[PDB]
């Protein structure tokens, strides 16, 4: 960045380094430098090649990246690093079981709709001109299909927002008592202090997007912006209804009417859905609530500090303005005529030869308008493809609990919370991640009396002397009895079977 430094490297693409050093660029200082390096992309002059492993900062190509480092600050080039080297200690009878967990709330940002625009053909092409408007009628029906395409895009944006957000039938609301099992939900529930009833995180997301004199200048050219059908208060009411239904009723408000349930029991059933027994939550509820509150505070601090994560929405603000400012700026082009102002052509030439000059301007402006409509159609298709995924994530993760791997956050999915954003939606994914691994010695089955004993659920492990059976995702050793194991076959088939005594709970009852 020019805010940081002014040093520049130059990459001559597809040029051998023995052929680059007259020349069309006037500058030549970065063509006969002392830091000439040869890549597959071309010849890089101005950056010293250091052979260390760093992640890619400025991508050059063919595995070569560049950065600005204190190597005394200079631009360096290197080979990009894939990641840290790891080696899993695989063995015939070794397993690793987590003895502790953590709760992680991550953020996913998805665009939903874009800016709806309308273009007047006659004011953009001619502009307060009568004879150009009479000459424009000979070109057929291009303006009608351009207006039809823009109307289709403008209807499709409201359809996208209606499809994503209006998945609930009744506007639920929370009770005034805000004790949801010790979990703190005050940063995502709506705040009546603001005139528009949005939460803290929704307000931060609205402030971190610089959503839009340029508008008055392009208003005079026949280029208008239509307002959306659903205001931001209505989107906030939809997200409030979805949050209240998810908090006070679980997944049951998606299948039908809302069924109330305490949040501790609901979240214990969320643990039971991912293969962890529900007594873990009832023994660690305070720790789980503290970890959730800490993760919510970390998201608040991250959104208050850095605003670069919302760029997926910011491009929706950018591409809908940069495409408009080009369309105004193509009115200054002449397209081979004598002037870019039609009134000068009318007042300086007679009607025999002025129309020849005016036809080039009309054809050029029509081609520019058709180009704008085509890029808008492609961008609308991309935005619709994103909005379908946003609606699917709202249906399958906010309104339920997904078993799809990495669909809603890294780890085993527990919850998701929706937030509105300028031209998009933000999902806070609450997931379960195993934390503290431990080594154990395992075996597939156990010989008790010449018959194999397989666990029903869980893993046979050993702590060195005794044998226990645990859960797969949490370490909880228990005495191997006949209740949690089942018998199948004899001991001569299973490879890796071991000898251990399987307890019988019925035998101490006979000793009474």
């Amino acid at each position: 960045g020019t805010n940081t430094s002014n040093q520049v490297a130059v990459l001559y693409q597809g040029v051998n380094c023995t052929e680059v050093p007259q020349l069309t660029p006037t500058w030549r200082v970065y063509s006969t430098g002392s830091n000439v390096f040869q890549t597959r992309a071309g010849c890089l002059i101005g950056a010293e090649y250091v052979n260390n492993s760093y992640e890619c900062d400025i991508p050059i190509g063919a595995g070569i990246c560049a950065s600005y480092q204190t190597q005394s600050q200079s631009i360096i080039a290197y080979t990009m690093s894939l990641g840290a080297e790891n080696s899993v200690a695989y063995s015939n009878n070794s397993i690793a079981i987590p003895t502790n967990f953590t709760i992680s709330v991550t953020t996913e940002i998805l665009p939903v709709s874009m800016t709806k625009t309308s273009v007047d053909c006659t004011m953009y092409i001619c502009g307060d001109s009568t004879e150009c408007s009479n000459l424009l009628l000979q070109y057929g029906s291009f303006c009608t299909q351009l207006k039809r395409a823009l109307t289709g895009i403008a209807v499709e944006q409201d359809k996208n927002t209606q499809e994503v957000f209006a998945q609930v039938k009744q506007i639920y609301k929370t009770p005034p008592i805000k004790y949801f099992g010790g979990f703190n939900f005050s940063q995502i529930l709506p705040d009546p202090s603001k005139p528009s009833k949005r939460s803290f995180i929704e307000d931060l997301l609205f402030n971190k997007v610089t959503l839009a004199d340029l508008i008055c200048a392009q208003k005079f050219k026949g280029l208008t912006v239509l307002p959306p059908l659903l205001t931001d208060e209505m989107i906030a009411q939809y997200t409030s209804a979805l949050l209240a239904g998810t908090i006070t009723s679980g997944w049951t408000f998606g299948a039908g009417a809302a069924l109330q349930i305490p949040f501790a029991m609901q979240m214990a059933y969320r643990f039971n859905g991912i293969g962890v027994t529900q007594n873990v939550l009832y023994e660690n509820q305070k720790l789980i609530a503290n970890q959730f509150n800490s993760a919510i505070g970390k998201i608040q601090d991250s959104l208050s500090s850095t605003a670069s994560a919302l760029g997926k929405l910011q491009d929706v603000v950018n591409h809908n303005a940069q495409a408009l400012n080009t369309l105004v700026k193509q009115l200054s082009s002449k397209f081979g005529a004598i002037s870019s102002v039609l009134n000068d052509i009318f007042s300086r030439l007679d009607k025999v030869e002025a129309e020849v000059q005016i036809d080039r301007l009309i054809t050029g402006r029509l081609q520019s308008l058709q180009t704008y409509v085509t890029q808008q159609l492609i961008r609308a298709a991309e935005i619709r493809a994103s909005a379908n995924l946003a609606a699917t994530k709202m249906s399958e993760c906010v309104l339920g609990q997904s078993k799809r791997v990495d669909f809603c956050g890294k780890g085993y999915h527990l919850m998701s919370f929706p937030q509105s954003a300028p031209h998009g939606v933000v999902f806070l994914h609450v997931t379960y991640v195993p934390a503290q691994e431990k080594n154990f010695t395992t075996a597939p089955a156990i010989c008790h009396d010449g018959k194999a004993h397989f666990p029903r659920e869980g893993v046979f492990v050993s702590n060195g002397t005794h044998w226990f059976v645990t859960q797969r995702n949490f370490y909880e050793p228990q005495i191997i009895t006949t209740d949690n194991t089942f018998v199948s076959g004899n001991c001569d088939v299973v490879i890796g079977i071991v000898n251990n005594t399987v307890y019988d709970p019925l035998q101490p009852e006979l000793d009474s």
Binding site: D120, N343, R348
Partner: protein, 284 residues
Amino acid sequence: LKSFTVEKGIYQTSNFRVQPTESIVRFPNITNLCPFDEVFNATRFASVYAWNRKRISNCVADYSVLYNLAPFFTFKCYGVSPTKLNDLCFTNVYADSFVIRGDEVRQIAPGQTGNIADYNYKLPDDFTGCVIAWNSNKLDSKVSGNYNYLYRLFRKSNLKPFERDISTEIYQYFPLRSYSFRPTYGVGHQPYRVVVLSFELLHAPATVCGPKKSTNLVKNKCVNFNFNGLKGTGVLTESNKKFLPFQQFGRDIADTTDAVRDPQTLEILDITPCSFGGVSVITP
């Protein structure tokens, strides 16, 4: 919809624009007349060296006086059609009046090569201007040749356009020739009085306007306006833009004039196009 039956919905039909009420013509109020009568009615024209470079400014140019004169050979114009020359205004008009034999009148043109056309003065390729000719055998042609006029035949270097490089040395043969204008010669060997008018179409405050009459000023209303040939339709409001004294026009992003300086009073007017929008029909 190209249909006799309209379904339930909202349909975009047309656009409304506020139509202008009055038409305003605005021009500077100079009253002096051009030195055209000192150019075409000259008693003795000059040669290609003295070249008769005449500046015309602060005039009310009436080109129809040239239209009321039948004796004109060619009135060939580039950039501006000759019939609309009264409806424009120009900054400074430069007249070049000279006498050349009828064979080499066609040589003097932009992008045309010749002896007189290259060795005396070129015409640039961006020449917005007119050339007028007349076959004047009554005054220019004399008995036993007219030896006063003297023209080039050989020059070592092709001159840059609109130059006055005069040299009478013997080149490497004396390169200057008297054409000896006689009344008994053929049509191609007759002298011609040629006047070339070159105008600058710039953003400067123009002085050589047409015979149009300025009207009163109407503000804060959708009116048609004409400022020194600049035609348009809009609302002229008072602007707080600080124009520098050399500046005349103000432009937008799309190279459109959005601020003007009046050619009579020294105030600055902001031009805003009249109110417009779309019309939607909400019906069952």
